[PDB]
C-alpha cells in the first residue's frame, strides 16, 4: 500500500473504505485478521439448520459436563461417607469437601469456558459483516475450523485490494446522497465527507485500485548521482541505500516462498517489506525514521 494514503489526514482509504485508522493500520502491520466477503444470503437459508446443529453440539458439551459433574459429585459423596465411617475429625471432612467442591467449581467453570466460547463463535458468526475485525488469532482459527465455509478472510495489503475491487462506488454514492437528503447533522457531516471523496473517485474516471502498488519505479541513475571518494567510497544520496534494502528484502521473500515455510515467517517478513516501501516513499512519516550515520 502507498504510504501517502493510509497515513494521510484525512486518510483517503479510511473514508473510502469506512474503516478507522486503527483497524486499517493493523492490516498494514500484519497485526490482526480481517473478514473480506460473506455470502450472507447463503448462510441465511440454513441459519435455522445451523442453529439446530448448535443446539445439538451445545447439548453434547452439556451432557459431557453433566456426566463429569455427576461422576465427581458421586465420588466426593462416597469419600465423605467413607470418612464418616472411619470416624475421622471434621477437619478431614472439610478438607475433602472443599477439595471436591473446588474441583466441581473448576469443572463447571471450564464447561462455562467452552459454552461462552461457543456463544462467542456464534455471535461473531451471525452478526458477521465486512470491515469487522478479529484481534485474537486463536478465535479466528476456531471460526475457520468450525465454519470455514462462508466467510473468507486474510490480513495483508492484498486483502484490501480484493475488498476494494469487489466493492462498488455508485451504490455507496447513492446511499450517501439519500442520507444527506435527511438531517441528523452529527452523522450528516461524516456522510458529506465520505460522499465528497466517493464522488471525486467516480468523476475521476479512475479506479481505487491505484492505492495498492505492485511495481514501484526507480528514478534514473543520474538523479541519484553515484560518487567515488579518494578511496572510492559510496557516499552519494542514500537513495541507493533504500533501493538496496527494498530489493534485498524482495529477493529474500522470493527465495523464502520458493523454499517453503509456515505462515508466521512469511507474514513477519512481509510486515518488514511493507515497512521498507513505506520508508522509501517517505522516511519519518510514521514511526522511528531510519538512521544509518
Amino acid at each position: 500500500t502507498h504510504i501517502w494514503y493510509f497515513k494521510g489526514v484525512p486518510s483517503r482509504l479510511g473514508y473510502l473504505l469506512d474503516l478507522a485508522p486503527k483497524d486499517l493500520e493493523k492490516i498494514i502491520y500484519f497485526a490482526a485478521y480481517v473478514i473480506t466477503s460473506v455470502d450472507e444470503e447463503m448462510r441465511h437459508n440454513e441459519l435455522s439448520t445451523l442453529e439446530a446443529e448448535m443446539a445439538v453440539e451445545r447439548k453434547a458439551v452439556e451432557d459431557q459436563r453433566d456426566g463429569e459433574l455427576e461422576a465427581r459429585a458421586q465420588k466426593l459423596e462416597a469419600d465423605l461417607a467413607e470418612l464418616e465411617a472411619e470416624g475421622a475429625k471434621a477437619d478431614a471432612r472439610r478438607k475433602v469437601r472443599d477439595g471436591g467442591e473446588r474441583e466441581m467449581r473448576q469443572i463447571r467453570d471450564r464447561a462455562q469456558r467452552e459454552l461462552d466460547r461457543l456463544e462467542d463463535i456464534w455471535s461473531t458468526f451471525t452478526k458477521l459483516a465486512p470491515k469487522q475485525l478479529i484481534v485474537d488469532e486463536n478465535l479466528y482459527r476456531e471460526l475457520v475450523d468450525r465454519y470455514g465455509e462462508y466467510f473468507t478472510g486474510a490480513m495483508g495489503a492484498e486483502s484490501i485490494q480484493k475488498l476494494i475491487e469487489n466493492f462498488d462506488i455508485d451504490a455507496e454514492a447513492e446511499s450517501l446522497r439519500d442520507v444527506i437528503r435527511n438531517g441528523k447533522g452529527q452523522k450528516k457531516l461524516r456522510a458529506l465527507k465520505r460522499l465528497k471523496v466517493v464522488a471525486a473517485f467516480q468523476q475521476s474516471g479512475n479506479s481505487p485500485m491505484g492505492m495498492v502498488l505492485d511495481a514501484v519505479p526507480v528514478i534514473p541513475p543520474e538523479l541519484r548521482p553515484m560518487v567515488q571518494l579518494d578511496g572510492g567510497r559510496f557516499a552519494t544520496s542514500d537513495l541507493n541505500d533504500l533501493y538496496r534494502r527494498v530489493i534485498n528484502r524482495n529477493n529474500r521473500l522470493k527465495r523464502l516462498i520458493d523454499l517453503g515455510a509456515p505462515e508466521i515467517i512469511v507474514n513477519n517478513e512481509k510486515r518488514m517489506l511493507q515497512e521498507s516501501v513505506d520508508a522509501l516513499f517517505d522516511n519519518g512519516r510514521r514511526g522511528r525514521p531510519v538512521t544509518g550515520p
Binding site: 502507498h2 491505484g210 502498488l213 514501484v216 519505479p217 516513499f281
Partner: peptide, 10 residues
C-alpha cells in the same frame, strides 16, 4: 511517485 503526470497537449 506513482503519480501519472500527463501532458494533455490537446
Amino acid at each position: 511517485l506513482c503519480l501519472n503526470v500527463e501532458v494533455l497537449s490537446s
